[PDB]
Amino acid sequence: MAIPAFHPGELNVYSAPGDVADVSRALRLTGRRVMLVPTMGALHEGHLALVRAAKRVPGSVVVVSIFVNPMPDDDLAQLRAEGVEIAFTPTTAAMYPDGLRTTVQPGPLAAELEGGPRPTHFAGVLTVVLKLLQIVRPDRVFFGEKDYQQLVLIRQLVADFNLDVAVVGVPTVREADGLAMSSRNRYLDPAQRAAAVALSAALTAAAHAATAGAQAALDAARAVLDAAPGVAVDYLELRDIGLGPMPLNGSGRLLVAARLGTTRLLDNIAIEIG
Amino acid sequence: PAFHPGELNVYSAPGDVADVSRALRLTGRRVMLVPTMGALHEGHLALVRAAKRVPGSVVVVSIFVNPMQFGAGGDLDAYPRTPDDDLAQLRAEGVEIAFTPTTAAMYPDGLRTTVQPGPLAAELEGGPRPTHFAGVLTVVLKLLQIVRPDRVFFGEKDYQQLVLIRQLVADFNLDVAVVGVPTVREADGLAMSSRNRYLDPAQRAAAVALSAALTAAAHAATAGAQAALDAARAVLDAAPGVAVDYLELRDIGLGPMPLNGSGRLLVAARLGTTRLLDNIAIEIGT
Ligand SMILES: COc1ccc2c(c1)cc(C(=O)NS(=O)(=O)c1nnc(NC(C)=O)s1)n2CC(=O)O
Ligand SMILES: COc1ccc2c(c1)cc(C(=O)NS(=O)(=O)c1nnc(NC(C)=O)s1)n2CC(=O)O
Numbered sequence: 001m002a003i004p005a006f007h008p009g010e011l012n013v014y015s016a017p018g019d020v021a022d023v024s025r026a027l028r029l030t031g032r033r034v035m036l037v038p039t040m041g042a043l044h045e046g047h048l049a050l051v052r053a054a055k056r057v058p059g060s061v062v063v064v065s066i067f068v069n070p071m072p073d074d075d076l077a078q079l080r081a082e083g084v085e086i087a088f089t090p091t092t093a094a095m096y097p098d099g100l101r102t103t104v105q106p107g108p109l110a111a112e113l114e115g116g117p118r119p120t121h122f123a124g125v126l127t128v129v130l131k132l133l134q135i136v137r138p139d140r141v142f143f144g145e146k147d148y149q150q151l152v153l154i155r156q157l158v159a160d161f162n163l164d165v166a167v168v169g170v171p172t173v174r175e176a177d178g179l180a181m182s183s184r185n186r187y188l189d190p191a192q193r194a195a196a197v198a199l200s201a202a203l204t205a206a207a208h209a210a211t212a213g214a215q216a217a218l219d220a221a222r223a224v225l226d227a228a229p230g231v232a233v234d235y236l237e238l239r240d241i242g243l244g245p246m247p248l249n250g251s252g253r254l255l256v257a258a259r260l261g262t263t264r265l266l267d268n269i270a271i272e273i274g
Numbered sequence: 275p276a277f278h279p280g281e282l283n284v285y286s287a288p289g290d291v292a293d294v295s296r297a298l299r300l301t302g303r304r305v306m307l308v309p310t311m312g313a314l315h316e317g318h319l320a321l322v323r324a325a326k327r328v329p330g331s332v333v334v335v336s337i338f339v340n341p342m343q344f345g346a347g348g349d350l351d352a353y354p355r356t357p358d359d360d361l362a363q364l365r366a367e368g369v370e371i372a373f374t375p376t377t378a379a380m381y382p383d384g385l386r387t388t389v390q391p392g393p394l395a396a397e398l399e400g401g402p403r404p405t406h407f408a409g410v411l412t413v414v415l416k417l418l419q420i421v422r423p424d425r426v427f428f429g430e431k432d433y434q435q436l437v438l439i440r441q442l443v444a445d446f447n448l449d450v451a452v453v454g455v456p457t458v459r460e461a462d463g464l465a466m467s468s469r470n471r472y473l474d475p476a477q478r479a480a481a482v483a484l485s486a487a488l489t490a491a492a493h494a495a496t497a498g499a500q501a502a503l504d505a506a507r508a509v510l511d512a513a514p515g516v517a518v519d520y521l522e523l524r525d526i527g528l529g530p531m532p533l534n535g536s537g538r539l540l541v542a543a544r545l546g547t548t549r550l551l552d553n554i555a556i557e558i559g560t
């Protein structure tokens with residue numbers, strides 16, 4: 001049967017998985033490289049940074065998915081203003097026509113850090129990311145480094161299941177004072193918003209303290225967190241770039257999570273030791 | 275990698291078969307995958323023949339004894355391995371690609387991300403082997419991603435496995451058609467199996483009771499479900515040294531729905547240490 005209509009240079013919106021699959025296949029056959037930016041809508045400047053990263057690949061056609069995963073006019077207007085040509089907006093029923101059945105089970109990393117208090121959270125994410133990859137079949141898929149544990153788990157999924165996509169991590173877009181962009185930032189009252197800059201300040205202080213070794217980096221970040229009121233730290237850990245044990249010197253990642261009132265915030269940063 | 279058309283080309287490295295497959299697909303060939311654990315018999319050859327019949331096909335047969343689907347034990351070590359006979363049979367059938375990866379190339383990081391099947395994996399064969407089908411679907415997903423076939427071929431003999439594979443394909447939006455091929459049988463009705471070689475002469479004589487029980491049931495079924503089950507039970511009971519593990523009549527999808535007009539009757543039984551499975555389509559009142 002017929003490929004659904006695709007109008008080059010305009011925003012084309014599809015909610016049926018088979019439709020975007022068919023258009024994506026047709027476009028790839030035409031000499032486009034299909035770039036996927038998965039989102040849950042309510043798009044912000046961090047999402048736009050993913051889009052801009054994707055658009056600049058020569059030959060790109062950009063697919064932005066908007067799917068709120070149980071396990072609008074404004075969004076489309078922003079994507080049109082960015083020159084995005086495909087929005088994929090499926091219903092929960094289209095994604096899960098047989099309900100919850102076969103799912104992805106992450107490796108033991110999912111049980112650490114964010115996976116601590118609820119060991120099935122990343123299973124939901126990795127399941128939908130796998131489905132979006134198979135539907136759209138992109139050459140590259142773009143995520144922010146903000147949810148870094150998530151991002152490492154997606155790289156694990158791609159390696160472990162032999163998937164033919166490149167995973168591109170885009171540096172986290174931040175507010176002017178360093179706070180990492182987040183849908184949750186608008187819930188902070190002004191005292192909480194002022195205190196919240198300690199997460200990014202702690203991590204940047206650590207990244208610079210790290211010429212003096214790992215202990216100095218951790219101690220500098222802890223002192224900065226300790227200078228902030230109402231910031232209940234859930235963890236502060238230095239790991240290697242794959243989230244295993246930090247090697248004695250070399251590259252790592254420093255991750256923090258804290259609760260301010262009812263709002264949980266996360267941040268992370270690249271660390272080079274000595 | 276080199277690909278010599280009309281000859282059997284053997285690749286161990288996943289990257290080799292993936293590149294060859296992609297190159298053939300881009301030039302118009304349709305890639306057919308038949309995933310096996312080796313020890314090939316005529317039942318496997320029927321899969322290969324179904325694949326070859328597809329116009330313009332190139333057939334890739336994988337042979338990999340997947341450690342993730344064995345629970346035990348010496349079950350893994352005990353699995354039959356006959357790779358010389360296997361490659362000889364593939365050459366005779368005109369297969370152009372065999373994919374024979376190492377365990378290290380499939381699982382370089384060990385068990386890490388895996389497929390978790392839905393609730394059907396804990397029933398029937400999965401009841402006492404709760405991780406068996408996660409091992410199967412994890413390997414089948416990986417072979418599908420490596421080879422990217424148009425169609426993949428499985429026997430109906432492991433019917434529960436086939437249904438789980440259809441679930442994997444639907445649930446992860448995989449772009450591959452699953453083809454189920456009817457069970458090839460010996461002249462007496464015995465389902466072909468790599469495991470039939472572990473039947474001694476007495477047990478091989480007795481083993482005809484599984485298929486005899488199932489066909490008796492499929493004919494009895496005009497008189498309803500109880501008659502079909504009782505006919506199969508009667509045949510299994512008349513058989514020396516057959517220990518029935520389960521005999522169950524389910525809807526065709528084996529899912530959370532009652533039997534209607536179409537059923538699958540499944541049997542598992544032990545002859546000494548050898549566990550045999552068989553199944554058949556059943557039409558009730560009809
Ligand atoms: C390049 O800079 C950035 C900076 C922040 C970003 C992003 C990019 C992308 C997001 C983001 O969360 N997008 S999302 O809602 O589609 C998600 N992606 N993964 C999520 N995981 C969970 C567990 O919700 S939510 N966020 C955070 C946020 O919106 O809350
Ligand atoms: C306007 O001039 C060009 C021309 C080519 C470009 C770009 C710009 C940008 C990219 C590109 O790779 N962008 S990206 O965001 O997908 C990546 N950045 N790093 C990547 N890979 C790794 C391993 O870090 S992918 N590329 C394609 C490339 O570099 O492969």
Ligand SMILES: COc1ccc2c(c1)cc(C(=O)NS(=O)(=O)c1nnc(NC(C)=O)s1)n2CC(=O)O
Nearest residue numbers: 309310311317318320429431456457458466467468
């Ligand atoms: C069309 O006719 C048939 C008939 C029987 C078949 C086949 C084809 C294929 C097989 C077979 O075992 N295929 S396999 O190597 O990919 C396996 N599939 N599931 C397996 N499960 C276990 C527990 O060994 S082994 N088998 C059954 C077998 O070897 O027991």
